[PDB]
Homo-oligomer: A and B are copies of this chain.
Amino acid sequence: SHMETYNVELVRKDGQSLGIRIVGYSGIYVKSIIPGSAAYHNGHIQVNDKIVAVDGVNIQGFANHDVVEVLRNAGQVVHLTLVRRGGGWFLDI
């Protein structure tokens, strides 16, 4: 059992979103990923990963409006740092 920190580069076109629904509460988490999106095609993002940095900026402790502000300026290529809980046993039931 452990924490994994990883970086992604997401590439999209003009007009396109990243393809991530975030949920805010403690931080921002990945709620869902739109199939066919930049986030889907990256292939490394999983539901419930915690987003801790966007485009070089550490967003931990940020209010909603401050999170919105860091993403507003996001371009065609967007860099995120995420944190994921790992280890634990698993079972397919």
- Chain A: residues with CB nearer than 8 A to chain B? 1, 17-18, 20-25, 31-32, 47-48, 63-64, 67-68, 71, 85, 87-93
C-alpha spacing A91/B25, complex, angstroms: 12
Write the chain B residue with the least CB distance to A18.
B93
- Give how many copies assemble into the complex: 2
Q: Is the CB of B47 within 8 A of A89?
A: no
Residue among A17, A47, A93 facing the most chain B CB atoms (10 A cut-off): A93
Contacting pair B23 A88 (CB below 8 A): yes
A25 CB to nearest B CB, Å:
4
**Cα distance, A88 to B47, chains bound together (Å):** 15
- Whether the pair B68, A24 counts as a contact (CB closer than 8 A) is no
